[PDB]
Amino acid sequence: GSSGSSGPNARSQPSKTLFVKGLSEDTTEETLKESFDGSVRARIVTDRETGSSKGFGFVDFNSEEDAKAAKEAMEDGEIDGNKVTLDWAKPKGEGGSGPSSG
After folding, report:
1. Where would I find the H helices in the chain?
2. Residue 45 in contact with residue 72, Cβ under 8 Å?
3. Collapsing DSSP states into helix, strand and coil, what is residue 59?
4. Cα–Cα distances in angstroms (integers) from residue 53 to residues 23, 27, 82, in the given order
5. d(Cα 61, Cα 16) in Å, to the nearest integer?
6. Among 43, 47, 59, 79, which residue is least crowded by beta carbons within 10 Å?
7. Would you say 84 and 78 are in contact if contact means Cβ atoms under 8 Å apart?
């Protein structure tokens, strides 16, 4: 039962835009936006060869807070009958430099 967290629960501050991966080639920014009750806008990536929705985009929020609160909601949500994974749009680097012990 013991359940409870504080803050973003990460090393650095959270992101305002939520990364949504696992959409349907048809999934439009429209269905992606609504999916998150609170967001202000939505974006979807498209291929340059085929010119069709790759299957992932992003959801812009007024603030990291609103975004997070929306992430937990759609945490296990599925857009257009398809499971989607929400993750904080954050880079990585030239491989793996940053988080370490010694």
Report:
1. 29-34, 64-74
2. no
3. strand
4. 9, 7, 14
5. 6
6. 47
7. yes
Query: Cα torsion for 38, 20, 55, 78, to the nearest 10°?
Result: -70
Instruction: List the determination method.
Output: NMR
**Distance set, CA 77 to CA 31, 47, 50 (Å):** 12, 25, 28
Q: Give the pair of three-digit tokens for residue 42.
A: 């939505």
- Which amino acid is present at 96? G
Residue ranges of domains in the chain, CATH in brackets: 1-102 (3.30.70.330)
What is the DSSP secondary structure assignment for residue 10, as one 8-state letter? S
CA–CA separation, 102 vs 92, rounded Å? 19
CA dist 3 → 20, 53, 102 (Å): 26, 38, 32
Amino acid identity of residue 73, one-letter, is: A
78: enclosing H helix or E strand: strand 78-79
CA distance readout (Å), 16 to 2, 66, 82, 85:
29, 8, 23, 16
Asked if residue 54 lies in contact with residue 24, where contact means CB atoms within 8 angstroms, the answer is no
Reading the block at residue 98, the tokens are 């940053």
